[PDB]
Amino acid sequence: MAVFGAAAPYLRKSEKERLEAQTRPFDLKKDVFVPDDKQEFVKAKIVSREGGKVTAETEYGKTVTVKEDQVMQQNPPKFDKIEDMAMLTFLHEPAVLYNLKDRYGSWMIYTYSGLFCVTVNPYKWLPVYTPEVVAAYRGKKRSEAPPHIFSISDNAYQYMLTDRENQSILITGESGAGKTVNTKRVIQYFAVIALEDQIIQANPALEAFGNAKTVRNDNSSRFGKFIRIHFGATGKLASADIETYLLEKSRVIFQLKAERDYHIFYQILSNKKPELLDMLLITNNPYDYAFISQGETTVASIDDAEELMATDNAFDVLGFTSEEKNSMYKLTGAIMHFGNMKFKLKQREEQAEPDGTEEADKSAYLMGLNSADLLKGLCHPRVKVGNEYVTKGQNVQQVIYATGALAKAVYERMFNWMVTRINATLETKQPRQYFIGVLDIAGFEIFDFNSFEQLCINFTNEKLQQFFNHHMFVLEQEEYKKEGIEWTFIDFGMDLQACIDLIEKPMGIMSILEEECMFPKATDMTFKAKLFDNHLGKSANFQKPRNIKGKPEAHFSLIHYAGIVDYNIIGWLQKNKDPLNETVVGLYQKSSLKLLSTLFANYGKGKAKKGSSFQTVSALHRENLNKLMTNLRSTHPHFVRCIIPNETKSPGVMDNPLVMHQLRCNGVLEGIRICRKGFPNRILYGDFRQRYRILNPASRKGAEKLLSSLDIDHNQYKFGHTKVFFKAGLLGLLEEMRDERL
Amino acid sequence: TTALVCDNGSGLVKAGFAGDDAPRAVFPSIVGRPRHQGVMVGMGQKDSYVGDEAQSKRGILTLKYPIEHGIITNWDDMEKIWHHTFYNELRVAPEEHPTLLTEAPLNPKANREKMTQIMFETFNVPAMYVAIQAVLSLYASGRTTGIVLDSGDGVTHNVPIYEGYALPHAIMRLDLAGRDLTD
Amino acid sequence: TTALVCDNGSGLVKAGFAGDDAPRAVFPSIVGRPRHQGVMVGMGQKDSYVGDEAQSKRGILTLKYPIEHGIITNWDDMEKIWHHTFYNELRVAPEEHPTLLTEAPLNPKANREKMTQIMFETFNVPAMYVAIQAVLSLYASGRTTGIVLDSGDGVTHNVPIYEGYALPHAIMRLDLAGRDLTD
Ligand SMILES: Nc1ncnc2c1ncn2[C@@H]1O[C@H](COP(=O)(O)OP(=O)(O)O)[C@@H](O)[C@H]1O
Ligand SMILES: Nc1ncnc2c1ncn2[C@@H]1O[C@H](COP(=O)(O)OP(=O)(O)O)[C@@H](O)[C@H]1O
Ligand SMILES: [Mg+2]
Ligand SMILES: [Mg+2]
């Protein structure tokens, strides 16, 4: 342990201190966990089990009684502070919570969780990240080294170098909790093992165009950032490639009452730059603009002024000139003025015509278009039939939907073009051999007012969890075939995929939603009735909602890996439609501005081109998720989990419900549940002999003789050639009879 | 896979894939035959010009409409029309594309029977369906009620629909159409 | 807790919580069935429109009153009426709410027995009671004597009451009511 310098204590405690802390009072019979009202569970001692009534004295001094059917054991001291949760003698839902709690109490930041890695952000500076640790760590394998990000990073690097296959890193956590600095230290480690400054410089540009304020977090990120780190032929750092996925467009137009839009619009409305406002003719009052005022106007999340100036400076020191920046601001201002458009019915026709044109005139002036041509295109879209063009009619609702779809699409194209420009500027001329992917994705967010945007995020997270489960099953089968201990070949994917098949497959929730908006008289009541007709009782996951603590509304409830989630139907049908307008896209292509580059290509011997009207956000989401899965599945994945310890900034204190929610959304409970159905506890024959041979004082014959005298049932264990597998109950029985033996 | 929507109509055949905003191929439903002898040797004129090609050679052909008022009267010409539409216009194999067909109300049952038999046997389409013109017209109009007046080149009819429920006893069919106007 | 006062009557179901000044939900007691086939697909029409909804779809439905003259002749329709009243008009679960019921004098005992059986079995109400439609009207008038003439839509009856003591031998029932006037 002398190699790990003075940072070893946080990295790993010494054997002497461990042995000193091993001996402390603990009765396995009546010091078990007890349910609590303030938190999920508390540490307490039960006086006695007097039938269906118990008396537990918690650390707070309460004498509450609890039902006897929800009691469960507590970790013995000899297994406390375990590095890996997979080796825990009893797998219980809050046992992992309490182990992490008392490990952070002694400041063990990094903890193995089988295939997962748990890392809680410390609130004070630590010497673990000192580069002397990095330089001297090389030469240690994952198994021997105490848990840390460097262990899995070196394992992935070795796998890439020797196995000659791509490796990917998957991080999970809330933005602003240290994810950015964690990625910074990871890329610094990669550079040490051989463009960190460029990444840090370009990060605020992506952060400002992709983050928005939500109820849970003031700096919540939405898009699925993904960075590919390339290497040279001789295993040396070569270049970095960055991509973006699953950017949400619904946030641009529809916002929840207590949530903001993207930081872009608020940052533009900063008064410290007066030239932009007057040159764009922007109304300085955010209240007037329709697209912004619907949500919460402003919060004290981050002071926007110097952030905007920092982004402008980062753009200025970047490769392109200021004219492109000005084009960016003016295009954003044009997106802003799309909400001022108004339309009214005609004389004796169902057709719609504009009333005001000043906002249309100014928007056309900014885009370099003609106001009359743009209005004619919006009101009368030209379409091609056979060999002849004909004009189509539009009412008020359709033109409003088209106006919203155009604003969403142009924003998407701008973001994608910006990402391409950043990737080109970052690009070096080094050859790109095998790469190491880094994936960042939004977590399994839970609210009391879940909607379509949260539904998409939950479905994506569930797909990712299913992928992780399949990977862990493959790893377990590989270990089983390595050890020759092979049983229970049933796959662990279909159990979770049962819920997936009711979302993406035909006759699923998403498919019915997509079909319903096409029916021209659809309403929310009809949509709910169809969902109930097609899924209530017929499926094993769809079920009635629950009304708890006066929740505002609930229409239907699903079951996921994270528990019961209910969603609100109201408002889903209106915002699912994304009908684009072809003639407006042609007019953009005919424009005199850079905007034509963004809309350069947009929409016989076999064709399936979906029409402009037949365009739903859900379909694009499914397509993007599928194209992402066709890319991520090609690489060997690794998982990193980040957990916030408390809601407050104060170090040391914890919020138990918060840690429960983090564990539930991170899927650790699912991992331990999948591990518990098999044989999670695996001990070597030599260790078992040096620990448990004393029980019957006197290697296959000896082990068999020893186990035959312990009344161990045949089905409770697996007898191998290198390791012997035991069930959780066997370890507890052995611990108890060792206790009575001593 | 994707579905195929073919509308035989009357005087104009229009077809295209499902989920499209407009038919890809629109051309008159005309089969023409050369009525003269032909003296040049080597060119090898074909014995039947079908579709929009017959419009180009209009001056040396006898244009015959395979259907008079909705009812198909010259079946062989209709196999020719359908083959042209499926191969030279859409360039797709109907072996893996379900086909939706449109058919006017109050027509002989033998017409629908022969249509389905031809589709299933000659072209081996995996699946097919026949629908009424008025219901589709009401679909495209963004409505669920109202009486629709469908007047093509073959026949004019009204079908009243209320709340997605039709009124079969109130369907009126009139054979006056565009062809009679031309005459 | 609170008690529910349901008044089935005939042709008008009115209900509300006890202690209210006026009934909360009043709607006709009819059950509608679509007598046509339906051509538009995907709408998913329900097979039975119940309550005030059926009044808006009179043109495509056939209306059958589940109560002819005081007595119930179609028990499935009456169960549908009760379910609609409990779950849509009032939006209250009858699991923890007693119900008070009314019916006309001189009615078959099987009707009352079946009503009680259905209300304890299907809905599982904690308790229920049946009262004469005339005595309640006498309460509502702030009186304790005199005769009351309850001419509804199903049946017309007279109940003489003096000082709170009913006189069963003087009760006269007549089947002429509003339905016969409409006919
Ligand atoms: N602009 C127009 N004005 C008047 N008549 C027209 C016009 N366009 C088409 N028609 C008539 O409509 C007919 C085409 O009808 P069509 O929609 O093809 O019927 P169907 O759907 O039964 O095939 C043509 O015969 C033509 O005479
Ligand atoms: N002002 C009125 N004029 C004529 N008929 C009436 C009037 N008020 C109610 N009715 C008739 O009375 C009937 C409803 O009587 P109601 O007391 O509701 O019977 P029940 O109590 O059995 O439901 C209706 O069919 C209606 O035609
Ligand atoms: Mg037609
Ligand atoms: Mg009455």
mmCIF file of C-alpha atoms in Angstrom, chain C residues 52-116:
data_model
loop_
_atom_site.group_PDB
_atom_site.id
_atom_site.type_symbol
_atom_site.label_atom_id
_atom_site.label_comp_id
_atom_site.label_asym_id
_atom_site.label_seq_id
_atom_site.Cartn_x
_atom_site.Cartn_y
_atom_site.Cartn_z
ATOM 1 C CA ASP C 52 -76.739 12.054 -21.654
ATOM 2 C CA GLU C 53 -74.277 10.964 -24.352
ATOM 3 C CA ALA C 54 -77.032 9.078 -26.186
ATOM 4 C CA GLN C 55 -79.063 12.286 -26.503
ATOM 5 C CA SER C 56 -76.347 13.795 -28.712
ATOM 6 C CA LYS C 57 -76.268 10.711 -30.977
ATOM 7 C CA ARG C 58 -80.011 10.225 -31.416
ATOM 8 C CA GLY C 59 -79.685 10.018 -35.195
ATOM 9 C CA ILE C 60 -77.553 6.864 -35.327
ATOM 10 C CA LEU C 61 -78.817 5.064 -32.222
ATOM 11 C CA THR C 62 -81.915 3.196 -31.107
ATOM 12 C CA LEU C 63 -83.093 4.241 -27.648
ATOM 13 C CA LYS C 64 -84.617 1.740 -25.216
ATOM 14 C CA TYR C 65 -85.848 2.756 -21.777
ATOM 15 C CA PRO C 66 -84.837 0.060 -19.246
ATOM 16 C CA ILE C 67 -87.887 0.928 -17.085
ATOM 17 C CA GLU C 68 -91.358 0.620 -18.603
ATOM 18 C CA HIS C 69 -93.778 1.384 -15.731
ATOM 19 C CA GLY C 70 -91.863 1.684 -12.477
ATOM 20 C CA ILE C 71 -90.555 -1.863 -12.819
ATOM 21 C CA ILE C 72 -87.238 -2.765 -14.452
ATOM 22 C CA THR C 73 -87.500 -5.031 -17.496
ATOM 23 C CA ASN C 74 -83.902 -4.944 -18.818
ATOM 24 C CA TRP C 75 -81.518 -5.571 -15.934
ATOM 25 C CA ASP C 76 -78.280 -5.263 -17.922
ATOM 26 C CA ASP C 77 -79.303 -1.790 -19.087
ATOM 27 C CA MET C 78 -80.224 -0.813 -15.526
ATOM 28 C CA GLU C 79 -76.831 -2.030 -14.316
ATOM 29 C CA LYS C 80 -75.191 0.092 -17.016
ATOM 30 C CA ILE C 81 -77.237 3.112 -15.896
ATOM 31 C CA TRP C 82 -76.187 2.597 -12.280
ATOM 32 C CA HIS C 83 -72.525 2.121 -13.196
ATOM 33 C CA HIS C 84 -72.546 5.289 -15.298
ATOM 34 C CA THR C 85 -74.223 7.234 -12.489
ATOM 35 C CA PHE C 86 -71.711 6.053 -9.896
ATOM 36 C CA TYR C 87 -68.536 6.359 -11.974
ATOM 37 C CA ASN C 88 -68.994 9.282 -14.400
ATOM 38 C CA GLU C 89 -71.694 11.710 -13.253
ATOM 39 C CA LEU C 90 -70.657 11.601 -9.583
ATOM 40 C CA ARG C 91 -67.123 10.164 -9.935
ATOM 41 C CA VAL C 92 -67.360 8.593 -6.472
ATOM 42 C CA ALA C 93 -66.617 4.978 -5.612
ATOM 43 C CA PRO C 94 -69.660 3.354 -3.944
ATOM 44 C CA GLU C 95 -67.445 1.123 -1.783
ATOM 45 C CA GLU C 96 -67.712 3.440 1.246
ATOM 46 C CA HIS C 97 -71.006 5.232 0.606
ATOM 47 C CA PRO C 98 -74.515 4.143 1.648
ATOM 48 C CA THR C 99 -77.256 4.565 -0.944
ATOM 49 C CA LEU C 100 -80.930 5.482 -0.590
ATOM 50 C CA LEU C 101 -83.280 4.181 -3.278
ATOM 51 C CA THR C 102 -86.835 5.021 -4.306
ATOM 52 C CA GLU C 103 -89.614 3.147 -6.073
ATOM 53 C CA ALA C 104 -93.350 3.401 -6.643
ATOM 54 C CA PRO C 105 -95.958 1.747 -4.405
ATOM 55 C CA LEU C 106 -97.445 -1.628 -5.329
ATOM 56 C CA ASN C 107 -94.531 -3.092 -7.271
ATOM 57 C CA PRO C 108 -93.468 -6.738 -7.674
ATOM 58 C CA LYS C 109 -91.338 -8.081 -4.842
ATOM 59 C CA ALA C 110 -88.921 -9.672 -7.318
ATOM 60 C CA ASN C 111 -87.937 -6.215 -8.570
ATOM 61 C CA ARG C 112 -86.989 -5.006 -5.088
ATOM 62 C CA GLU C 113 -85.189 -8.251 -4.238
ATOM 63 C CA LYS C 114 -83.142 -8.179 -7.445
ATOM 64 C CA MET C 115 -82.282 -4.502 -6.960
ATOM 65 C CA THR C 116 -80.999 -5.236 -3.457
#
